[PDB]
Design a binder for this molecule. Structure first.
Ligand SMILES: Cc1noc(C)c1S(=O)(=O)N[C@H](C)c1ccc(-c2cc(F)cnc2Cl)cc1
Length: 250
């Protein structure tokens, strides 16, 4: 049967979020980018609500919670995109929302084809490894807890206990399907290395994000309130590597 913390993680998963995109008019760079940022804002709000329901998280210092959301939102948003894309369109379109779906031809015709390809790796990776919903749920929690400040957190001990608990739960998620010691330990190496590898992909999204933010008036791409806050709060510091990426393997 499904381990209860994994069953809890499924009950608190954010519900479907609509981008609000007018599909009756042709695509332009600004309309698409604006819709994606608006979707971004709504998804960020749902990450915050999710984190308040996420066992352990509310028990960290309030400054730590904020910092970890500010550090990880981009990883969580693209991991989420990867999963929706995998689950609804077999990983072969980018499923940002039910009303905002980009097949490859729509990607090609956008003003950000390369960004689309970069983001598209993630669902292609889920397809390859046949990632379970239970694995996915646990790995997503680990992304929230995957970077800390160079000086550490105010609630460092509590944080380590929480992170260690979800690592243990990921191992149980793996145990549901992969029977055998050698297959399960190799599976744990694969999934955790995928998380290590995300840091690089995310860094490219962070740079693109910062460049777009700087240039937002020229591009006609608005950045809503909470998104503007998390970018201004931490993004240069993150790009600079003035944080501590947690790694599973050297
Ligand atoms: C890239 C990127 N990621 O987040 C933000 C914000 C950016 S950005 O380049 O500053 N803005 C553009 C419009 C943008 C591009 C992609 C996404 C985005 C990315 C993602 F992986 C899952 N969902 C969404 Cl809505 C959200 C916004």
């Amino acid at each position: 049967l499904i381990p209860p913390l994994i069953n809890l993680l499924m009950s608190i998963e954010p519900d479907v979020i609509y981008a609000g995109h007018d599909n009756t008019k042709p695509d332009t760079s600004s309309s698409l980018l604006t819709s994606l940022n608006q979707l971004g804002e709504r998804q960020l709000l749902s990450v915050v609500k999710w984190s308040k329901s996420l066992p352990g998280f509310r028990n960290l210092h309030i400054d730590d919670q904020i910092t970890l959301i500010q550090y990880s939102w981009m990883s969580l948003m693209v991991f989420g995109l990867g999963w929706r894309s995998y689950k609804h369109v077999s990983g072969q379109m980018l499923y940002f929302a039910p009303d905002l779906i980009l097949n490859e031809q729509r990607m090609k015709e956008s003003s950000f084809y390369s960004l689309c390809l970069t983001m598209w790796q993630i669902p292609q990776e889920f397809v390859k490894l046949q990632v379970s919903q239970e694995e996915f749920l646990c790995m997503k929690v680990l992304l929230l807890l995957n970077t800390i400040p160079l000086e550490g957190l105010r609630s460092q001990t509590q944080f380590e206990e929480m992170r260690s608990s979800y690592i243990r739960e990921l191992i149980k998620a793996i145990g549901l399907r992969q029977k055998g010691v050698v297959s399960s330990s190799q599976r744990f190496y694969q999934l955790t290395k995928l998380l290590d590898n995300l840091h690089d992909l995310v860094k490219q999204l962070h740079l693109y994000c910062l460049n777009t933010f700087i240039q937002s008036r020229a591009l006609s791409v608005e950045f809503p309130e909470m998104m503007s806050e998390v970018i201004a709060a931490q993004l240069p510091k993150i790009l600079a590597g003035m944080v501590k990426p947690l790694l599973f393997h050297k």
